């Protein structure tokens, strides 16, 4: 990092076991990530598993999927940005 | 708008405490984007000099309207998520 | 209202070649923000599969009007400000 203030995407986080298992399933090989990296790999995961609705691709169905255990819900919308960050932060520990 | 919206483009209707704060810095509307809320909130802290002179990420808000929104005597603007949490609890998203 | 615009909020009027590319992917207007121009140009490259399947940052556009847009038979998505240079040369920034 550097002298310049960090933005939220630069925040270093340690994902909890379920989120870490999701991240490693798409090839990530570390225990500490930036929030940008979590969002990047989470997008790869949803794409690879094709969890989005074919017609309304902002709706993600996660029932019967690891992601559904992370969210605690059977589906979510990508349009609700801060609800997705809320799910992510509940599944990690921000590094001091 | 056709192209997907980002979080800063979210249209919001601030609740009364936050609306009073926003309007005190000259903003004269009831519907804002999240970018405007951040902008006018930043202006409010800066104009009222609520930040600590030595550690300018620390904002003191005991005895200020901002303290009624945050529910804490002081906060750090390095904890981005916690400021967004406070903001969303003080508005209704136009969804 | 008094909030300054970022570069991606700049209003632009694409010249005929760039406008045709944007309209080909469904856009139905003559004036855009720079963000919309980037959005539709990426949608154009993706839909038409102009990127190389193996090295997906390389765009091969020799038999496409996009090649005329850039003034080259191919280009790299990694060269950020070179792409902005070509986009700015294909539009008028509105007063």
């Amino acid at each position: 990092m550097s002298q310049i203030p960090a933005s939220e995407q630069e925040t270093l986080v340690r994902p909890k076991p379920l989120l870490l298992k999701l991240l490693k399933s798409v090839g990530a090989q570390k225990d500490t990530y930036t929030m940008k990296e979590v969002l990047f790999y989470l997008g790869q995961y949803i794409m690879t598993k094709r969890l989005y609705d074919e017609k309304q691709q902002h709706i993600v169905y996660c029932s019967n999927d690891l992601l559904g255990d992370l969210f605690g819900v059977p589906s979510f919308s990508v349009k609700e940005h801060r609800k997705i960050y809320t799910m992510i932060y509940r599944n990690l520990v921000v590094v001091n | 708008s056709q192209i997907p919206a980002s979080e800063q483009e979210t249209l919001v209707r601030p609740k009364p405490l936050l609306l009073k704060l926003l309007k005190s810095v000259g903003a004269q509307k009831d519907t804002y984007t999240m970018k405007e809320v951040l902008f006018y909130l930043g202006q409010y802290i800066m104009t009222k000099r609520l930040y600590d002179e030595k550690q300018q990420h620390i904002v003191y808000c005991s005895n200020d309207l901002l303290g009624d929104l945050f529910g804490v005597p002081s906060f750090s603007v390095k904890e981005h998520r916690k400021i967004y949490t406070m903001i969303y609890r003080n508005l209704v998203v136009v969804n | 209202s008094q909030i300054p615009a970022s570069e991606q909020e700049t209003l632009v009027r694409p010249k005929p070649l760039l406008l045709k590319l944007l309209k080909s992917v469904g856009a139905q207007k003559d004036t855009y923000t720079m963000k919309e121009v980037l959005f539709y140009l990426g949608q154009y490259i993706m839909t038409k599969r102009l990127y190389d399947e193996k090295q997906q940052h390389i765009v091969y556009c020799s038999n496409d009007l996009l090649g005329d847009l850039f003034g080259v038979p191919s280009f790299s998505v990694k060269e950020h400000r070179k792409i902005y240079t070509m986009i700015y040369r294909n539009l008028v920034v509105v007063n």
Binding site: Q9, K36, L39, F40, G43, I46, M47, Y52, Q57, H58, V60, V78, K79, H81, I84, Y85 | Q2, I3, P4, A5, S6, E7 | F39, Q43
Partner: peptide, 11 residues
Amino acid sequence: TSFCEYWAXXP
């Protein structure tokens, strides 16, 4: 609009 477009409009 695609999932990737929706995802790119939160990295």
